Structures are given as structure tokens and as C-alpha cells.
Symmetry: C3
Subunit: 313 residues, 3 copies
């Protein structure tokens, strides 16, 4: 498992601004140093310098469309080059809008990618169904093919090309879904495991089916888009859209340890960590701490232990 | 799902007095407004004016027997009229003693009702087995038929008529059961899932069996008597008899979402919420918040999402 | 279930010193009084007077080897006499080093004993693999037979005789295992259920397999070595080596209730409770409280209730 770290300090996908410090604070926790403490080749591509777009009025309801649209365009080319250097792209960003650029760039080199989206939300609103206008809640809407012809021409997204069908993706962790989003869900037949299915089936079976549904037919590259608000806020409090009744720390770790085990992880997003939203210095370290553990799990660290191919006795 | 809200500000089923404010504080959280935000017809029958009975000395050990007995008599007729108006009675009360009046009134119109009792306690003490004398811990004892001839003549309960057998009921959440209560349990063969069975089987299977045991033979109206102390106190702290090792928020939501799905919910009690018992303004809002979510789940709100029968695209 | 309480106020198995107060503070919680409130014969053998060994320099990296070694030798003879008086030895100690003396003494009278080790760690480091030198993280290494000839001659342990194979033991709760320890695990084929297997299988199945793997062939005496850091620190915070992502309070209770039910419990250790490590008086009572509940579960207290062989009606 060879990683390719990409800093994406972007926040215009939503209101609150501290999420652009994510790349920074995660790096201080020692992520790159801990990844190396393992069995991976870590190559830091730094923090993408996101240019400022002054003139960016809302498109109807959409907010900062040219800023978000250009930030993904920028990140898409980055994830593409990294995948071209044969590396698991790691997008440490701000808000989830960037997911558009990640899934896009990742797919350019791997059209047969599968997407597991751990989130408390489906983030599948269209520019025409969103009531918030916040784009970090619409990324999935720009990526799905069935939804082609439903997504209007929004300034800053003409470079977009829906790279995934409604079947190449599974949601895990849902607990705050809008009416229109739920309609798309059922209507497009998108496979998902909300907190209800997790409660009923157990995180064990949940992951069995998820990986079975994406890798059943054949094996394919996998993209994990992890929104920290997927886990219960008692675990990741410093995030913009917390919702109670979330995935436990343990469950969070189980999902990724299982993903790692497929040996099919290709792309990973760790999003929505916003330090300035912590009510205490501890809630910050706690949110960051859990973000880093989730990541290490993605690249090898196992709870039962780890050991090199040598004789320890 | 058509509801019939009934305010039952009663506290004499136990010592602590703030539980009579339950109806009030739940209403401020916006319950009636949120129920309407859904797919239900909400008709508020207000807060039952519970008359004061000055002369009500204890019956041996039983405390405030004429006060509790009359409060249930009063509520029974209320739940009966509502069920007669074809509505799911919602009893927002104080202590669990009132359950006597709810199960009674509910049954008058539906003798074939099934009872699911989510509680950390069995509340099945008799006036002769209770060591506390608190009636909010004896309600089940007055309702069971097998226990006919075991329950002495207590002032204020001559109007009582045991409306349910030991089989028409299932306990979920048990973790603090008295010796005598456990004897009745095993002796009368009452079906239950304590925190041990929940741990072993999973809340998924637990609900599968519970609904299977009550609806196996045939379908019948269902009465959910929900004591908030059923959930772990980290979720509903403002309550009189907290016991650690309880049902999670998630599990609490799973139970009701499943109950709603039967389309057989007929009666619902949300009990033991006592604001004055919160050690902080937050523990109050947290207990109320969770009480309201539990209720909405009972009438439709699903974690995977909700949407009207229309085309959202 | 007849118990034999043994106080083991020892802390030299690790750095922090407040763990030797464990015996004391657990006794104040009323353990002996609560055990009696049940169906057991409680005989207190008091707090072993652990003699002070001034001259005890480290052995290479091993720390306080003669102090730890002599404390186990002392406790081994104690657990042996108690088992000889036909009683379930209860070792309320400090650090986990003492486990060496408990498993040893216990086995002297029962060579066919089975060991269930609830811990966040495997505590199977050798004096040659440990990087901390702390012996409370090496106890298992002195007890296993396969590891005979791998454990150097350490001052204070010449009295040791490996009493268990790699198969007579099951680990439950693992989440912080060293490289060398993981090598021994896989290499010696030790059966274990880390937090990953618990997440995947459920504590129900976990206990099914554990007891099945130790009692499959035939029934045998069982030794439960319970390290409080096995449970999530939100449950047992006052302990020296906390690790997040642990066993819940509920799971902690399920493990022991199931163990009790085998009727095969013979030896029990309740370790690593360190009051002085609590950041608040509440974290102390919370850690102690949970330690006592875990113990009562081991001797009978059930969450569904308990009752004598009499007619309560
Ligand atoms: Mn998101
Ligand atoms: Mn989210
Ligand atoms: Mn109750
Ligand atoms: Mn209760
Ligand atoms: Mn240990
Ligand atoms: Mn440990």
C-alpha cells in the first residue's frame, strides 16, 4: 500500500471556515510520520494552493460555485497524476465538495472504480433540490451518470463529467437525509446502509455485504470518501454538521480495517474536520486523533497487532 | 398513523416531583409541530387536570394510592375516547404508574392488544412485594390476569380490571429487577429481553423475536409503554431511576422505527422524563431531545430518510 | 460459587504506584458485603503483606524483577491454599504482573485449567522483547510452555514453572499489541478475539466460541484474568494503560455473566485499577464501581434479575 498525500485546504463548499485548516492540523498529529512507522511509501504532494476567486456570486441558490468548481478541477488533476504514479491518493481536505474533484481525478485513470461513502448524509442534493445551497452537500449529484441532464450548468463545473453510476456506490452511516435525496436514493436504486441497517445487521455483516456488492462480479479499484461527521460526534465533535446516533469509534475502525484487507483501496478522502469548531482544545485533539486512526487503519494498522516478516524470538 | 396526544402531568407514582412537568417541556421542544412536519394528523387533547386528593394516607406500604388510582382511572377513560376517535393515543406523562390507566383505557376498545414494555425495570411489583411502596414500580402488577387474586384491594383501584395475560407482553431493556419480580417473571412465563439478551442477540434479532412473539399467531393492536430510563442515562439523564448499562440512542431508535413499520402501533407512552432531575440545563435538553426523537420514530421519521409520494426531480 | 478473597497490593509490575491501593478501595465499595448479599460464602484472606526488596536493580531491561518475582511466588502459594480449601480465588491486586503468581498457584491444584484473558493488551512480552521493561506486560510470557527456553533466567523467578500451553488460553479485548507479541500470537497459534473480532462477530458469538474452544473437548476449571483496561476508559478511566476503542460496560458484564453460567469459574483476577490515576473523584468511583459490578457478575448477579428458591407470592 503506497500512498500519495494531497493537501486540499478548501472550505467554500459550506459556510464555516476552519475546515481549510484540516490539512494543517492533521499533519501536526504526525500522520506522515505514523504512516511511515508502518509498511508504506509516503510521498507528500503538499497543500494545493487554492486560488481566490473574488467575483463569485451565487448561482440561483448555489454558493461560491466557481470557487468550489475550480477547487475540484484543480484537485482532480492532482489525484490523476498521483494515481498515474501508482499511488493511493490521500485527500486531506476541508469540506466534502472537493469529493467531486477526487472521484473525478481518480476515475480518469480508473473508470471501473467503486465508491464507499461513509457519511451521516448522502450529499446527493442537486443544485435544484438543495435548500442550503452549500455544495459540500451536492458532490454526489455531479458524479452520477443517471443524474445526467438533471444537474444544470453551474459556473465552474463545465469540466465535470459524471464518472459513476448509481450502482458503483454504497453509503454507510446515513442518519440525516433530505426528502429529495431520499427520492433519488430509492428512485436510482442506490445501495446503502444507514444507521438503521447498521443497528439491525451489525457492522460486521454491513461490511460483508458492502464489499460483496461492489466486488461481487469482479474486483475493481476502490475509493473511500470518509466524512468525519459519519462517526458519532462524541468521537469527532469538531465538524460542521454533527448528527447524534452515529458510528462508533470501533465501527469506524472496523470499516477501514476491512477496506484495507481487500488490498483494493485506491483513493481515500478524510473530510469535514474543522478544528475551529471544537468547543475545547480536547474536542479538537479528539476529532483529529480519531481522523488519524481512521487513516492508519486504511493503510495497515490493525487492532490485533502488526509485525514485519521476521523472526521476533 | 393518526395520533391523539394526552397530557398526563402526574408524579405521585414515585417520590421526586418534577416528572409532572414532562407534558410541558416536551411540548416546548416542539413535538406537536414536528409530528405535523410529518405524515400525521395531530390532535391535542391537552394536559389532563389531575385533581388533588389531600387525604390519601399510605395503604400499608403503598404510597398515594387514591391519587395514583384516580389519575389512571381518569387517563383510562381519556385513552378510550381517543381510541374511539380512531387515533393512536400518545400519553406524555410523569411517572410510570399512569401506565395502568393507559393499558386499561386502550384495551377497553381493543381487548386483543399486545404490550412491548421498554424499561430498565419490570415494574411488576405487587402491593405485597414492593419494598419502596412507589406505585410507578407496580403498574404491570395490576394489569396481568394471572396476578388476579394476588393484588389486594387498594384504595383508588376498585375500578381496575386486569386486561392482559402474561403472554401479551414483552419486556425490552431490563437491568434492575427485584427478587419477587424475577420470580413472577419466570413463574408466569413472561417473555423478555434484558440487556443480556440484547448483548447476546443484537437489537436486530431482539426486535425480530419480540414482534414475532406478539404478532406470530395473528396481527393485533400494539401498545408501547416507553420508560425513558430504558435508555442509558448518558442519553436520558433527567429521570428518577437511572441504571447504567442501558440501551443506546441508536437501539432506542431502532426499536420504535421497527414498531412503526408494523403499522400496528395503537398506543404509546413516553414516561419518566423529569427535567428538575437534570444536573445541567444540557442534561435536560438532552433527555427531552431524545424523548422527542423516540416519539417521532414511533410515527414515521426514519434515519435513512423520508419523502412524500411525489417526483422530486 | 464459593469465593476466596486475596488482597494483592502490588505495583512494581509497572511505574505508577497507586495500583497497590486497589485491594483497599474495592473493599470500601463494599465488595465483600455485596458478594454476601448474594448466594456465596465469602472468606477474606486479607491483604498479602508484600515485603520490601531494597536491593533490586534492573535485569538488563526488566524492572524490579526480584520484587515482582517474589510477589507472585507469595501469591501463588496463597491461591493454592485457597483452591485447596475448595474456593474460587479472587485476586484483587495492583498491576497485572501478579497474574504470574495467580495462574501458577491456581494450576498447582488444577493442571487442566483454562485461561480467558480480558485485556487491551496481550501482556505476552518476554524479558527479551519488552521495550518498557515493565513486568505487568510480560506475565503471560512466563506461564506458556512453548515459550520455555525463550524466557531467560530473571532474578526472582527461578520458582517459576510454565503451567499453560498456547491453546489453554483465549484473549478477549485486544487493541494495543506490540510487534513481537503479535509474532508470538500467530506463531504459537494463540486463540484470540481482539476488538476487531468483537466488532465483526458480536460479543455474543465471541463468548460462544471462546467457551466452546476451551470447553469443547472436556470441561475444566477456568481462570479469568481481568485487566480493567480491557473496558473502554470511559468506563474504567483510573488505570495506568488506557486505550480507546474498548469493551463496553454491557459487553464487560456479558462476558462474566456467561463465564459464571458455565459453573466452571475457579480463579478470577481484577487488575490494574489505580485510584490515584483518576482525574476526578468521580472517575475513581466510576472505575471502582465498574470493577465491582464485573466481579458480582462473576459470582451470580444477573441483569435479568435474581431470586432464591422460594415462593415470592
Ligand atoms: Mn459529507
Ligand atoms: Mn456528513
Ligand atoms: Mn418504568
Ligand atoms: Mn424504569
Ligand atoms: Mn494487563
Ligand atoms: Mn491492559
Amino acid at each position: 500500500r503506497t500512498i500519495g498525500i494531497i493537501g486540499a485546504p478548501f472550505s467554500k463548499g459550506q459556510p464555516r471556515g476552519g475546515v481549510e485548516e484540516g490539512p494543517t492540523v492533521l499533519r501536526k498529529a504526525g500522520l506522515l510520520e505514523k504512516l511511515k512507522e508502518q509498511e508504506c511509501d509516503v510521498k507528500d504532494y503538499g497543500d494545493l494552493p487554492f486560488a481566490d476567486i473574488p467575483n463569485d456570486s451565487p448561482f440561483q441558490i448555489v454558493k461560491n460555485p466557481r470557487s468550489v468548481g475550480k477547487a475540484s478541477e484543480q484537485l482532480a488533476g492532482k489525484v490523476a497524476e498521483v494515481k498515474k504514479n501508482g499511488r493511493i491518493s490521500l485527500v486531506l481536505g476541508g469540506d466534502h465538495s472537493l469529493a467531486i474533484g477526487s472521484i473525478s481525478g481518480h476515475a480518469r485513470v480508473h473508470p471501473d472504480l467503486g465508491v464507499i461513502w461513509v457519511d451521516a448524509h448522502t450529499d446527493i442534493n442537486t443544485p435544484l433540490t438543495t435548500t442550503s445551497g452549500n455544495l459540500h452537500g451536492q458532490p454526489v449529484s455531479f458524479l452520477l451518470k443517471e443524474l445526467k441532464g438533471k444537474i444544470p450548468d453551474v459556473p465552474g463545473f463545465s469540466w465535470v463529467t459524471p464518472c459513476i453510476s448509481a450502482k458503483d456506490i454504497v453509503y454507510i452511516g446515513l442518519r440525516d437525509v433530505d426528502p429529495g435525496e431520499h427520492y433519488i436514493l430509492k428512485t436510482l436504486g442506490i445501495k446503502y446502509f444507514s444507521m438503521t441497517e447498521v443497528d439491525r445487521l451489525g457492522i460486521g455483516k454491513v461490511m460483508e455485504e458492502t464489499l460483496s456488492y461492489l466486488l461481487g462480479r469482479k474486483k475493481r479499484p476502490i475509493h473511500l470518501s470518509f466524512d468525519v461527521d459519519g462517526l458519532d460526534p462524541s468521537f469527532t465533535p469538531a465538524t460542521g454538521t454533527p448528527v447524534v446516533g452515529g458510528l462508533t469509534y470501533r465501527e469506524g475502525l472496523y470499516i477501514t480495517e476491512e477496506i484495507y484487507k481487500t488490498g483494493l483501496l485506491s483513493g481515500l478522502d478524510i473530510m469535514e474536520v474543522n478544528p475551529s469548531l471544537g468547543k475545547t482544545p480536547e474536542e479538537v485533539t479528539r476529532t483529529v486523533n480519531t481522523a488519524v486512526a481512521i487513516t492508519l487503519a486504511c493503510f495497515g494498522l490493525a487492532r490485533e497487532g502488526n509485525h514485519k516478516p521476521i523472526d521476533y524470538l
